Structure 1
Amino acid sequence: GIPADNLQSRAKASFDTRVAAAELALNRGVVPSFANGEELLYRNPDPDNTDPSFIASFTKGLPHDDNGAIIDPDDFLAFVRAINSGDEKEIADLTLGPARDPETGLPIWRSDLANSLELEVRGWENSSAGLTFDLEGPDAQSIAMPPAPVLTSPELVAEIAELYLMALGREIEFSEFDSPKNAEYIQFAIDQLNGLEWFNTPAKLGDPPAEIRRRRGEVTVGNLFRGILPGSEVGPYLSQYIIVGSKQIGSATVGNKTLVSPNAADEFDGEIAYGSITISQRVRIATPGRDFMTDLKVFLDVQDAADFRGFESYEPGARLIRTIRDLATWVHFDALYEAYLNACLILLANGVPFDPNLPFQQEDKLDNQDVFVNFGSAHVLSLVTEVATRALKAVWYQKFNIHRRLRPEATGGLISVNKIAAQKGESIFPEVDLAVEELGDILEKAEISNRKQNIADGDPDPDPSFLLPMAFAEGSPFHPSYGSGHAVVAGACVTILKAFFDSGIEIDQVFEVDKDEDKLVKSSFKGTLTVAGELNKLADNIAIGRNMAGVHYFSDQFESLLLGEQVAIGILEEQSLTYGENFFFNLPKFDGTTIQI
């Protein structure tokens, strides 16, 4: 008899498809996640005390002493238990915030400011989201990020140096990185980083492969404060997709006729055609020069959960992203997949072709078929957004259940307390002795900057402070540093877009923001950019924006980008079983290789 397949009911075929996708995910296997060993390494310095200090772990929210170390190690050990359990009662039983007044129930803050504002506590953001399953994609716990840099490492010294230089450079305009007026500071930044082992010495055989991949070499004005995804280091700092508008409604080719929108100039003034309405690329303007958490008491109150969210001031209006601070503002409030949805809308409006390995991409006279729900605009619009929460669950597992890395503000706190104590001949937080020893010139600039801030904030003769100035009044979100929600979502979303569009398409005209006015100008860049390169650059812009705010380190961002790429690839692979058509997605990965899915 002739070999054959058999039909079954549609309902059974749907069931079997879903099981087959689950089986595909199961059969990938799983890998463990390894932490860097600091959590039980660092101990309470008191001779009669055995306990771990947890000084290199995220403990924002747990009550801290006057040096920034948690008061009771049980509070962190209980927090870790609650993270792994997810039980709501167990979470509500944790200690959050500083001691409360028995009579009134008020938290008593250290700072006159927090007390005068009558601030209450804020709580951890889904501390057990890393337990949540998902109907599609790799399970949150099936994949891993490598151990985070340790406080004593050359990598961390380099990372924290970079963050202080970004903080002190927040008023520098991207379009003026190479300008004479900025040469003293820009050359200082470049020279300071080039003076650090991480950047001036290569990795050595036998180093962890993850370190080898992410290690950076000589700092130049061309790579200063940039990421390392392919494409990010070519052409202007900012992706075209975060400053340019799009083709507008009314510009069209109809047979042999070209029509021109009466609003066509809006494309070059930062308006994205968003359906029949618009998105403006112009960002709100945080007050120039105003940074936060530069006073130790206010800093500790924030470490003790004081809710300063919403405390920033702004100038009137909005402008195309102009300064480093503006990119920090952009990433303070962006709505999840916002940057990538906006890029997607630009690509759609501009008529950038979809990946030619999808079906039905030919002229309709040849294939009799146009695209929309599958392989067209609606399909990519849903896919680019849906990957975001799957990527977040994976990075949340790394953040809370595995690594619990302290945020950069907390490292700056250790540095400041250490240096202040050392000036009185006392050793506090020797774990950061190397950073203090190597970053003297930078820390002296931070001290001057912080004194000016502290004076502006109403303290006429402030104590010296070497804290890392924060762009945001509340500093980091209420979750650990490693990895990043923004960077994992960037990695997943730009993976989708590079796969879905023909991302080898070359960009025709390259723009930057004008040095003198709030407008776009043609770039002097001589070279070719591609859609894929500019999408990778967009991911690096959002991810580094968090670093420029003071809330992530370089390694958090790069490792998160890789994690997001894995999540998106896994979703595409599992969804491949749902279609009858003959096609695949061509995906140029962050590593420069291509996978066909």
Structure 2
Amino acid sequence: GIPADNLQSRAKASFDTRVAAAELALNRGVVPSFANGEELLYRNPDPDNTDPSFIASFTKGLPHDDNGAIIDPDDFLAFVRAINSGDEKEIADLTLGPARDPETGLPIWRSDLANSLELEVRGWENSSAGLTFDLEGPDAQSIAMPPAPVLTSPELVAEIAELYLMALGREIEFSEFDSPKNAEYIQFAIDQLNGLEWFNTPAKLGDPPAEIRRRRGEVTVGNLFRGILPGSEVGPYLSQYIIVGSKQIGSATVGNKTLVSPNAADEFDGEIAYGSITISQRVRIATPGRDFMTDLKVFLDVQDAADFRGFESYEPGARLIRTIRDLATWVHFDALYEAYLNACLILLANGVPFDPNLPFQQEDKLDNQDVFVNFGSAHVLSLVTEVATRALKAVRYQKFNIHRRLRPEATGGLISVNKIAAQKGESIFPEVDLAVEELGDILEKAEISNRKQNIADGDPDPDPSFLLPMAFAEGSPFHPSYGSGHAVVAGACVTILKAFFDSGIEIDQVFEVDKDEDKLVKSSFKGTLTVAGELNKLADNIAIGRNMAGVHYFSDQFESLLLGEQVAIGILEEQSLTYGENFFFNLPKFDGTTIQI
């Protein structure tokens, strides 16, 4: 008899399809995640004491001493148990914030400011989201990020140096990186980073492969404060998709006739056609030169959960992203998929073709089929947004269940406390001795900057402070540094977009923001940009924006981007079982190879 398949009911075929995708995900196997060894390494220096200090772990929210070290190690150990359990009662039983007044229940802050504002505590954001399952994509716990840099490492000294340079450079305009007025600061930054072993010496055979891949070499004005995704280092700093608007309604080709929108110029003035309404690319303007958490008492209050969220001031109006601070403001409040949805809307409005390995992409006189629900605009619009939460569950697992890495502000706190103590011949937080020893010039500029801030904030003669100035009044979100929610979603979202569009398409005209006015100008770049390159650059812009704000390190961002890419790839693979058509997505990966799914 002739070999055959058999039909079954639609309902069984649907069930079996979903089981087959679960089976595909199971059959990928799982990998463990390794932490960097710091959490039980560093010990309380107190002679009669057998506790870890937890100084290199995220402990924002647990009560800290005057040096920024947690007072009671049980508070961190309890937090770790609650992270692994997820039980709401156990979470509500944790200690959060500083000692409260017995009679009134008020938290007593260190700073006059926090007490005068009557601040309450804020709590951890989804400390057990890494336990949540998902109906699609790699399970949160199936994949890994590699160990984070340790405080004593050349990589960390380079990372924190870079963050102080970004902080002190917040008022520099992207379009003026190479301008004479900025030469002194830009060259100082370049030379300082080039003076560090991470950047000036290559990895050596036998180093961890993750280090080899993410290690950077010579700093130049062309790569200063940029990411390393392919495409990020070519052409202007900002992705086209974060400054240009799009083709507008009314511009169209109808057979042999070209119509021109009466609003066509809006494309070049930062308006994205968003259906029949618009999105403006112009960002709100945080007050220039105002940074936060430059005073130790206010800093410690923030470390003790004081809720400063919403305290920033702004200038009137909005402009195309102009300064480093403006990129920090952009990433303070974005929906995590916002940048990529906006890019997707630009690509759609501009008529950029879909990946030509999808079905039905020919002229309809040939294929009799146009695309929308599947393989067209509605499809990509859902898929680019849906991956974000799947990527976030995986990065929460790394953040809280695995690595619990301290945020940059906390590292700056260690550096400041150490240096102040060393000036009195005392050793506090010797773990950051190398950073203190090597970043003297950068720290002196931060001291001066901090003094000015602390005077402006109303302290006429402040104690010296070497804290990392924060762009945001509350500093980092209430969750660990490694990885990053922004960067994991960036990695997942631009993966979907590069796969779904023809992302080899070249950009026709390249723009930058004008040096003198709030407008676009034609770039002088001579070279070719592609859609994939500008999507990678967008991911790097959002991710590095967090670093420019003071809330992530380079390694957090790069490793998160890779994690997000894995999540998106797994979702595409599982979803491939649901379609009858013969097609695939061509995806150029961050590593320069292409996977066909």
Tell me how far apart the structure 2 counterparts of residues 325 and 160 of structure 1 sit (CA, whole Å): 18
Cα displacement (A) at 1:68: 0.0
Cα distance between partner residues in 2 of 1:398 and 1:392: 10
2:273 is paired with a residue whose SS is strand
Report deviation, 1:154.
Answer: 0.1
Distance 1:335 1:174 in 2: 23
Cα deviation, 1:538-570, whole Å, max 9, x if unaligned, reads 000000000000000000000000000000000
How far off its partner does 1:143 sit? 0.1
Alpha-carbon distance between aligned partners in 1 of 2:145 and 2:335, rounded to the nearest angstrom: 24
Distance 2:127 2:208 in 1: 29
Quick one: distance in 2 between partners of 1:187 and 1:465?
A: 25
Cα distance in 2 for residues equivalent to 1:262 and 1:318: 24
Shift of residue 304, structure 1, vs aligned partner: 0.0
Cα offset, 1:298, TM superposition: 0.0
Map 1:240-279 onto structure 2 (within 5 A): 240-279=240-279
- After superposition, give the CA deviation of every residue in 1:68-95 in whole Å (9 maximum; x if it has no partner): 0000000000000000000000000000
How many angstroms apart in 2 are the aligned matches of 1:542 and 1:240?
13
Q: Hey, what does 1:39 align to over in structure 2?
A: 39
**Matched residue SS, 2:91:** helix
In 2, the alpha carbon distance for the partners of 1:27 and 1:454 equals 57
- SS for the counterpart of 2:590 is coil
Which runs of structure 2 are paired with 1:180-195 in the superposition (5 Å)? 180-195=180-195
C-alpha distance in 1 between matches for 2:463 and 2:390: 45
**Residue 18 of structure 2 aligns with which residue?**
18
Distance 2:420 2:49 in 1: 24
Counterparts of 1:373 and 1:241, CA distance in 2: 24
Instruction: Give the C-alpha shift of residue 185 in structure 1.
Output: 0.1
CA distance in 1, matches of 2:351, 2:234: 24
**C-alpha displacement at 1:148, in angstroms?**
0.1
Q: Which residue of 1 aligns with 2:340?
A: 340
Deviation at 1:195, TM superposition (A): 0.0
How far the C-alpha of 1:501 sits from its partner, in A, is 0.0
| Residue 377 (structure 1) shift | 0.1
State the SS of the aligned residue for 1:374. coil
User: What is residue 5 of structure 1 aligned with on the other side?
Assistant: 5
Give the secondary-structure state (helix, strand or coil) at the position aligned to 2:216. coil
**Structure 1: distance between partners of 2:225 and 2:399:** 24
- Compute the TM-score of the two structures, normalised by the length of structure 2: 1.00
- 1:389-408 CA-to-partner distances (Å, cap 9, x unmatched) read 00000000000000000000
Q: Equivalents in 2 of 1:281, 1:273: separation in Å?
A: 11
Q: Deviations over 1:7-46 (max 9, x none)?
A: 0000000000000000000000000000000000000001
Task: Describe the SS at the equivalent of 1:278.
Answer: strand
Identity across matched positions, percent:
100
Cα distance in 2, alignment partners of residues 471 and 212 from structure 1: 31
The residue correspondences of 1:107-126 to structure 2 (distance < 5 A) are 107-126=107-126
Quote the offset at 1:146 in angstroms.
0.1
CA RMSD of aligned residues (A): 0.1
Displacement of 1:524? 0.1
Partner of 1:578: 578
Long gaps (5+) in structure 2: none
Inter-partner Cα distance in structure 1 for 2:92 and 2:506: 53
Q: CA deviation at 1:515?
A: 0.1
What is the CA–CA distance in structure 1 between the aligned matches of 2:540 and 2:315, rounded to whole Å? 27
Instruction: State how far apart, in whole Å, the 2-side matches of 1:212 and 1:521 are.
Output: 38
- Count of residues in correspondence between the two structures: 597
Deviation at 1:289, TM superposition (A): 0.1
Report 1:270-289 matches (<5 A): 270-289=270-289
Q: What's the offset of the Cα at 1:283?
A: 0.0
| CA distance, structure 2, for counterparts of residue 301 and residue 283 of structure 1 | 30
Q: Distance in 2 between matches of 1:35 and 1:186?
A: 35
**Structure 1 residue aligned with 2:228:** 228
Q: Distance in 2 between matches of 1:192 and 1:250?
A: 52
What's the counterpart of residue 419 of structure 1?
419
Where do 1:308-319 residues align within 5 Å? 308-319=308-319
CA displacement at 1:336 relative to structure 2: 1.7
Between the aligned partners of 2:538 and 2:72, the Cα distance in structure 1 is 42
Task: Please state how far the C-alpha of 1:236 moved relative to its aligned partner.
Answer: 0.1
Aligned residue for 1:136, secondary structure, equals: coil
Shift of 1:349: 0.0
- Distance in 1, matches of 2:232 and 2:350, equals 22
Gaps of 5+ in 1: none
- Separation of aligned partners in 1, 2:204 and 2:412: 29
- TM-score normalised over the length of structure 1: 1.00
CA distance in 2, matches of 1:87, 1:374: 40
Distance 2:205 2:262 in 1: 61
